Amino acid sequence: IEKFRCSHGYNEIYKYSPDHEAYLFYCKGGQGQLNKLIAENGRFM
Amino acid sequence: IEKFRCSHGYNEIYKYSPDHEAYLFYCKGGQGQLNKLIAENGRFM
Amino acid sequence: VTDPEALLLLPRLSIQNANAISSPLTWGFPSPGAFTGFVHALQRRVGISLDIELDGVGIVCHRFEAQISQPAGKRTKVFNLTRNPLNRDGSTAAIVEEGRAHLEVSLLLGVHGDGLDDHPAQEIARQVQEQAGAMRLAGGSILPWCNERFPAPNAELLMLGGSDEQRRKNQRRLTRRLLPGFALVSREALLQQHLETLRTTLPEATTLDALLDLCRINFEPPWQVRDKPGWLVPIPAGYNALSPLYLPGEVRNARDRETPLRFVENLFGLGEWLSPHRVAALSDLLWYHHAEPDKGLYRWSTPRFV
Amino acid sequence: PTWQELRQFIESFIQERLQGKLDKLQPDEDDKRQTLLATHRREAWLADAARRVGQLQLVTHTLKPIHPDARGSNLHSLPQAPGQPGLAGSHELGDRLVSDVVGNAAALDVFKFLSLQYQGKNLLNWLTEDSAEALQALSDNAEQAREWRQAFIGITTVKGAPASHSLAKQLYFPLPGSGYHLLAPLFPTSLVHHVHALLREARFGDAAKAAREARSRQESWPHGFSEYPNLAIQKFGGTKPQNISQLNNERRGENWLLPSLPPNWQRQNVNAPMRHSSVFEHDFGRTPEVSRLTRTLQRFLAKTVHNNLAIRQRRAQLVAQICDEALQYAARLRELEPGWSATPGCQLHDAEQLWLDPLRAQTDETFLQRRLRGDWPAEVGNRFANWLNRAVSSDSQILGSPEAAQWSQELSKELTMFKEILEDERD
Amino acid sequence: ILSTASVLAFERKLDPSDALMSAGAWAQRDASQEWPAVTVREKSVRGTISNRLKTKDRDPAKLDASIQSPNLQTVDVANLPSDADTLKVRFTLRVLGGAGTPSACNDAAYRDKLLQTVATYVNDQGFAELARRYAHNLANARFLWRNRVGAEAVEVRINHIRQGEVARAWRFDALAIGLRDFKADAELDALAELIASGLSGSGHVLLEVVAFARIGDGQEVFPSQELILDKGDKKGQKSKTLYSVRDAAAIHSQKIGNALRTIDTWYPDEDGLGPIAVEPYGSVTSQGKAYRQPKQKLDFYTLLDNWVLRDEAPAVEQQHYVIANLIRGGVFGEA
Amino acid sequence: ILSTASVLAFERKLDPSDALMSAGAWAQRDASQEWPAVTVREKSVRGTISNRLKTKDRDPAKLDASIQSPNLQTVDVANLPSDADTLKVRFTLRVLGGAGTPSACNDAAYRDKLLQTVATYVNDQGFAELARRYAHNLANARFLWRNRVGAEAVEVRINHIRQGEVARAWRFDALAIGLRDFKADAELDALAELIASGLSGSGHVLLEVVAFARIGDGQEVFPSQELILKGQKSKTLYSVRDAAAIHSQKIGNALRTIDTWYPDEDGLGPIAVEPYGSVTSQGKAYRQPKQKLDFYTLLDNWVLRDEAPAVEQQHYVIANLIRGGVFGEA
């Protein structure tokens, strides 16, 4: 289960939250900010 | 375009910054510190 | 040394420009030797008149502010200096960097002697307070609390209690009074056993390196910082001999010619800033003088701590 | 171990110095090459170097960091080990002594001459020990070798009667019986140089830089690294740091003092709850230190029993610390401001009655003081335990295991101590 | 032979504190214990070049290229609030006492000779010319250094503080008491006898000095400026940093002390300056020139040697200056 | 030989304060002591590219690619409220006096010569031409820098403040008084005599200058702007305590704008009195040292070798001494 989800056309990064079963808005940015956040935090929770 | 500017009466060395088009305060000192900084960093940017 | 018969509390004392340079390796709070020498100067100036022996000192430090400034783009700090006068020609003199700091400490100094029975407790408390008002604590003037809301007075707690409960009760009363500070104690046994564990890790390790390891925030791979028990700091724990002890009238340019001189060098121990109600015994947490002059080793510590 | 190899080595050093001076001379006339080849090439170089020894001195503890118009004595003395355990300084340096040099900056050729490791050891170390290959390379007859040996040894010996200037520090020490020792301390340049080297490899060393980068990559490095926050830089020579010492040119000033600071060295100001949302946000009123401390409480979820003994000890002293700074925050609010009774309303969480200790008795004589001395409001421990119960994770396996039982018993002991200190507020 | 002691050191008597400045409105100065503090804040200054040019920067192409690039700082500034026209500067001062006894002296013969010389002076003429001038420099608010030069009215309140409460309160009009004339007054002489009894006694006499000045609404006040070397490397930093103890602007204690020591009217050069600070080889920092040179026989060291060693007692003005140095402090001694 | 002193420092006469700007409605300017402040708030901006391309960027595909990614900033902006059309800018100004005396001087001979020079200036002609121009720059609201350039009506109220209260009040139409002509009036000459008696040291002068600019509802006002070292925060405005303000040195530069004697034409008008009299907006130094008309050559000829300049040039020299600075070499 992926920790971050980039909404691609809308330039928003959604980070998974475990309390409610959903993604919440983390920050703006595209694929580069998504990959940088994956490198920092690690994907797959 | 000179990299350092000594304000002579006030004993302040101003170093040129390129982002804004102006000089900013670098350190205190007079002609000797100015010449020593010119020898270290090179003038004319 | 000997245990205190009473425990005088000098109140919150404001020191305006104390020596923030404790040692050649440490800056920050002044050396505990300043406080032990201050208490011995108090004994030298009123203790011979009130027939008491002021000995030992508990350091609390309600607030502290080093006159420092972090420069732009650096993680380190520098010291705000003073402008010394010019020389006889008008040239700027060579700047010698002195650290200055504003302290608010309170001194738990132990008192014992035959003067406790001769005078009232508030009388000798007011006497040593009126003497300490005209003194200096680490090179810094003692600010004497004029025209504020109310002066913080003294309370000479008698260490001899009628019970264990009365002893704990007025000890808790005193600890509530010196509560917004942080007591400074000497923790050398922890430094020694940290030397032993670090020598088990890699051999021929100095306790200079064990001290440095206890200071730094070192990171560990799985990343996690190393936990530290309490607020561990390096302190200068006295002096060690570099020279044979010279005769009084033998060394050139001494302070006086009736005192033997010996060139010495600092000894860096370890201290721990803890809240004062952790110790459960305020008869402890007092900094004494241990010379052993034949070997060198002029040092200060808090004996009877643990 | 042959004197001929030592002789051609020192003549190579002399001619290297000569070609250096003629290369940085830029000469075209005036015949200074004749004087340079007469003085800086032959065995006269050894004679003027043996003359120039007496300006220099090998030292470990100099006076010049204390106010630089201090013509006192400097010492090359290594102190004996303290018999008492714990404390240490500069007697740890057995083979790692750097041996600072003081004296004139013109006569450094004597030191760079004497510091050489020609055979396998130091030239002063070969010249102090009487041997065969020593006393023969820098000679043709014996007596000039004698006087040049007694010249080259004396760089480690003090010069003049022992003295410390009026600008130097001299501090009395109370002896146990009576009387004093005058104790003039000196600046340890060797110990400062060793700690400066250690801090330089700790901050700018490549083995530290690699682990610092691997922390950002979040990969596993073999070793770790350190940071050393809150260092203070202290410079000794003002604009000419060379006039103090030799090792004051490696570290250009820059004493690099370690922080010895009390924990209240960052002044935190006071903030009392006023409104309803201020009573909501300022009941706990939590500083960055307690969040840093409870972040470590959340990092104590897993436990193996042999480690869990020390982990439970750490949790015991940790909850003692969180009680300590809770009582500290309450005390500094209760003595600092009258803001707990600044303005009334309906929402202040008034059941606390610990953050307003002089705000209810020194103003209201029988209205709130008799409503607090007989009631003895100390009930903040169970609400603080409810707040502290968040610090552990709400895991079903964590509550089903006995770790929650150990957590609750140590928490109950520490809230009992918080109760015992919180009850005695009427004395 | 009675040579000079190799370690001489006198502790600083007349020890002031850091002069905290706070602000409020005039004609409610008596309720000025809850006046809010003057805070040090940041502002950006941008200037053209105004220095003298070094005769190689006087090409008008080079000048017009230079003034298109201004020089930007971020200075600290301390202003009064926009609805407060009075600066309240409030420091304390301990007059310690034992003014002749050195903190360090080598030769016990020299120490007893110096104590005999000082007691000869005190029994001859006590601290009554010196404490009158110290009471003047407390009376006129000279410690208000640049906060005094444009004030409408300066009023200085001095309170002698006994064990916990005020023992005696003064009040001066600091603009009427000039900056150059050490005249006579009843309250000034009462303060002079108090500072004399401080400097002569064994215990300390504590004074609380408060000074108000009408500057104007929102005008700039001048706290002490910090001497920081190593301003920074490769970034933009502060050119002027103001002293502030606890988020509250302040004058350094040594600046207040230099204002209190400004009593020396006896230096042999003419008094175009007026009084200067009491210093050995009396050297005004702003002037950059050291009066009382050792070329003449009128510095501190040669006067102290002639007074103590060979008993050549100088004029009463010069020994006023010598005892003023002994109250000032200092670290003396040869190799 | 009388060379120049190695230190000279003149204090700043004409000390202004931070000019606080608040906002309300015109025709109730006389009840404008409780007007709410103009608060500096933030807003977002999008820019397209608009600078010149350096002929490597003139690829059309590269230009469209730079246009598709615009720069986002967050600027500080100060506006009037939507129900307020008048900007009240208020500051106080201290005219100190003792203009010729330096705060520091090494050479006592040079100090006495300079004091004699300024004394024969003041005796030959008072601070009357200079205070006329300083009272003009108070009267026409030049210290309203960009808040003045499109205002319907500007009105300045200058109150001389004695002990606690207004000793004498002035009131001007700041658009009738131009930004370039120093003419005569009764009230301007009264204010000029007040500033003259202040600069002569013959009185304590503290003014309270309030200026109302009638801009329009909700329009943009321009407080002073600070230096910054997507949310790039490209603009920061000066505000003292949640209330926009002009820097005191900007009010000081607008008060010093009296120099109409520079050797170039008078179609530009008054500039600020500076050594090597320079306007940074025009990038050009009038009073260049190639001509003998800067501050330093005029002062060094007037004081050292007694070459008194023209009367307007010594007006400029004494205006520079009123301005302050460090003169003298290293």
Author numbering:
A (entry chain J), B (entry chain K): 80 to 124
C (entry chain B): 3 to 224, 239 to 322
D (entry chain A): 8 to 434
E (entry chain I): 24 to 358
F (entry chain H): 24 to 252, 258 to 358
Question: Which lines from the publication concern this structure?
Answer:
Consistent with previously reported structures, the Csy complex adopts a helically twisted ‘G’ shape with Cas5f, Cas6f, Cas7f and Cas8f protein components integrated by the crRNA. Target DNA binding and R-loop formation induce conformational changes in the Csy complex, enabling it to recruit the Cas2/3 nuclease for degradation of the invading MGEs. Here, we report the cryo-EM structures of three type I-F Acr proteins, AcrIF4, AcrIF7 and AcrIF14, bound to the type I-F CRISPR–Cas surveillance complex (the Csy complex) from Pseudomonas aeruginosa.
There are two AcrIF14 molecules bound to the Csy complex. In contrast, the N-terminal domain (NTD, aa 1–80) shows no direct contact with the Csy complex and is built as a poly-alanine model because of resolution limitations in this region. Two copies of AcrIF14CTD interact with the thumb domains of Cas7.4f and Cas7.6f, respectively, mainly through polar interactions. In addition to the thumb domains of Cas7.4f and Cas7.6f, AcrIF14CTD also interacts with crRNA, reminiscent of AcrIF9 (22,23). The pi stacking interactions between Y89 of AcrF14 and the crRNA are sequence independent and will likely be maintained with different crRNAs. A comparison between the Csy-AcrF14 structure and the Csy-dsDNA structure suggests that AcrIF14CTD competes with target DNA to bind the crRNA and the thumb domains of Cas7.4f and Cas7.6f. Simulation of AcrIF14 binding to other Cas7f subunits shows severe steric clashes, explaining why AcrIF14 selectively binds to Cas7.4f and Cas7.6f.
